[PDB]
Design a protein around this ligand. Structure first.
Ligand SMILES: CC(=O)N1Cc2ccc(Cl)cc2[C@H](C(=O)Nc2cncc3ccccc23)C1
Ligand SMILES: CC(=O)N1Cc2ccc(Cl)cc2[C@H](C(=O)Nc2cncc3ccccc23)C1
Ligand SMILES: [Cl-]
Lengths: 298, 302
């Protein structure tokens, strides 16, 4: 029993965190094989013009108390790829994956190439992450651990005026309509990840919380009309199919749980809580619920 | 900016997780140097659990009865001893991944990270607080026994909890790394119940200071309170009494924000009375109590 916002074990990622210094700028790098990946704003804009003026010895890379010598440098979108002489012995089995909004991942927050914390995050529908980052956190990575392979999905670049965070996949492609420079940028209007709220309602049912259940069901269209009114993401047939295992395990049809969410959206919690929360939680995917309520290890 | 329930990087702890098997029972062990620490109930059957004489059960065991597995490598148990409710399995290999570590016993309200494991394999990390009733609100399934709670301060891992059992209310009970239980619990299947829980007041105030540091000031008021009047109100909402130690501990946050601890107490009294009125504090509709004053300073400064 119990339901916590759980992150993947960070160990495999910790062995990849390095410090990247270029001029006065210090941020984090991800060292995989003989390449160090970091936000290209470390050189700061005409990034091709700024990069051509740099030599390899301008980038000081530090792995623990050991300096790595940079032998090459190239830019891929908004990421700088610093070729180094030493291949990281702690390099795990890894993939670079771009995630979709609503998908969750763990963030290993670092300062000066040193991991300080791990937390669970969701890619908001507005392509921002509600993270916890201070200055120096740039280059901190987001990941999922699939069996023994680390899927790198996020590299932190900046903080938006509302305190939310923006970053790229490991190929330098930003999540959202953001750019890596000091200009007027704002996070768009956010929405609730519906499939994730339903998944968390199934996790509450598995944990004995059933007060919100009702005898009612709904059509997917009737629910999507209600969801749109509360700034909830449209629920697709794919989401309904994805919730299938949880629906079979609890005996509550996805549209039956949708009718519960409909009543929670119109009537509220009425002083009650679900899994210790007075708000409907949307940062647990259906897979996160199955992994935590069945016990998958890495 | 931002405030998250943040756990410590688990890597140092992951390199210590092993699987301990005794007959049919399988649980996790913490391998530090040449010793594997695990709950002593690994020697028990499900029947024995009501009234087990652990000294009697342990004297009947030999070293080769304990199968210890570190990854895909079986470790050879060369000795065994019991220290309170922990079994210390001396092994023939010192863990090369052994970090700088300390065994620390924590007080209620203190927080720590939990690396939940099954079969010596880490599956997740989350943040926890030792409840005032000496239980932890964890996320644990069968086979999680032996999972550890820790803090990482600088480069040293402070081991503070080892998971032993789940109480009937879904909450968890365990020991420090010396085998001493937190709370009036025993490693037995006897009728045990978690006492009435209370909110860790110093932690709620710390989280209100974190909200102030992050620009949330809606809940502040023009009032102050005496410490005694705050506790008289706090007790009515099942909040832990706030001591002068707590007031002193909140000093740095009070200085940083400019809001006296007893003024922050007056805000809390008002939030208890009024509720949130559809508003949130740090993305939460409830008053959060699993962030200590130390956690807030570390997350809001470095
Ligand atoms: C002065 C400032 O805030 N910056 C401007 C900026 C613009 C564009 C890009 Cl790509 C990066 C950045 C950096 C930036 O967002 N850095 C930071 C990242 N994550 C959290 C932070 C929390 C407090 C401060 C900085 C943080 C630096
Ligand atoms: C009732 C039961 O399964 N057990 C009886 C018991 C009594 C005393 C001691 Cl010290 C240990 C234990 C074990 C126990 O609590 N194991 C478990 C630990 N953490 C979460 C669990 C979640 C579901 C099931 C077991 C869990 C086993
Ligand atoms: Cl303590």
């Amino acid at each position: 029993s119990g339901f916590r916002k759980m992150a993947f074990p960070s160990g495999k990622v910790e062995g990849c965190m390095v410090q990247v210094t270029c001029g006065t700028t210090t941020l984090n790098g991800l060292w995989l094989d003989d390449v160090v990946y970091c936000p290209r704003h470390v050189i700061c804009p005409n990034y091709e013009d700024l990069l051509i003026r740099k030599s390899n010895h301008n980038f000081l890379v530090q792995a623990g108390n050991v300096q790595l010598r940079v032998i090459g440098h190239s830019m891929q979108n908004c990421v700088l790829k610093l070729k180094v002489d030493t291949a990281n012995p702690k390099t795990p089995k890894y993939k670079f994956v771009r995630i979709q909004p609503g998908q969750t991942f763990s963030v290993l927050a670092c300062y000066n190439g040193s991991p300080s914390g791990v937390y669970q995050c969701a890619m908001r529908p507005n392509f921002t992450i509600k993270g916890s980052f201070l200055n120096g956190s740039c280059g901190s990575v987001g990941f999922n651990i699939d069996y023994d392979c680390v899927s790198f999905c996020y590299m932190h670049h900046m903080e938006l005026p509302t305190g939310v965070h923006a970053g790229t996949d490991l190929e330098g492609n930003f999540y959202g309509p953001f750019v890596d420079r000091q200009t007027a940028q704002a996070a768009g209007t956010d929405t609730t990840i519906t499939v994730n709220v339903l998944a968390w309602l199934y996790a509450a049912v598995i944990n004995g919380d059933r007060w919100f259940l009702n005898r009612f069901t709904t059509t997917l269209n009737d629910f999507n009309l209600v969801a749109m009114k509360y700034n909830y993401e449209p629920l697709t047939q794919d989401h309904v199919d994805i919730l299938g295992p949880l629906s079979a395990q609890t005996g509550i049809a996805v549209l039956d749980m949708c009718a519960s969410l409909k009543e929670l959206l119109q009537n509220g919690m009425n002083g009650r809580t679900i899994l210790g929360s007075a708000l409907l939680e949307d940062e647990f995917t259906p897979f996160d619920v199955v992994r935590q309520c069945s016990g998958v290890t890495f």
